[PDB]
Amino acid sequence: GCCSNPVCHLEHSNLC
Numbered sequence: 001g002c003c004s005n006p007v008c009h010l011e012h013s014n015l016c
Contacts, residue, residue, distance in 0.1 A: 002008040003016035010016075 002012060
């Protein structure tokens, strides 16, 4: 995580 988990990535998609 964050960007490397698909869920934590999308919760803050600005941060992936």
